[PDB]
Amino acid sequence: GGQWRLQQGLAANPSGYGPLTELPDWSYADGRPAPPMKGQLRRKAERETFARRVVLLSQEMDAGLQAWQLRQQKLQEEQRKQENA
């Protein structure tokens, strides 16, 4: 029953993101935290490269529009500075 979980903003599969799969399964009995799970390290690597891609594409879009606005402003300056003499 995962369409319900999509209604609530959860992962459609309870083995997705969230507290069942991302907290560590075990600790030491002293209370020392375990070394991290292999799948959680892998998964954090995937999420980080995804975030880097979001930032990278966003910045290329913004730099793209700024460079276009310089080309338009300099076209208009080349219009007004050639209507003289």
């Binding site: 290329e60 879009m61 793209g64 529009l65 460079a67 276009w68």
Partner: protein
């Protein structure tokens, strides 16, 4: 002869609904085609110069004295 159940119609329909929303989100680009031009030419060129560079840097590995002599250890014995 094969006939169409309610499962098949409801499945077909939910695919049609995903499709219609794909039509919606493709109807409003962030840039025009004039604005996007060359906005990523540098990164594409550097990426291909990396592909090109890994292609043209292919050569036999270094050979070492220590490996060849290290084969002598197959008759290491005790005393």
């Amino acid at each position: 002869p094969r006939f169409v159940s309610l499962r098949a119609k409801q499945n077909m329909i939910r695919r049609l609904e995903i499709e219609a929303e794909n039509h919606y989100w493709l109807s409003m680009p962030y840039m025009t085609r004039e604005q996007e031009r060359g906005h990523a030419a540098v990164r594409r060129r550097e990426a291909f110069e990396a592909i090109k560079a890994a292609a043209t840097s292919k050569f036999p590995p270094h050979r070492f004295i220590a490996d060849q002599l290290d084969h002598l250890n197959v008759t290491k014995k005790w005393s």
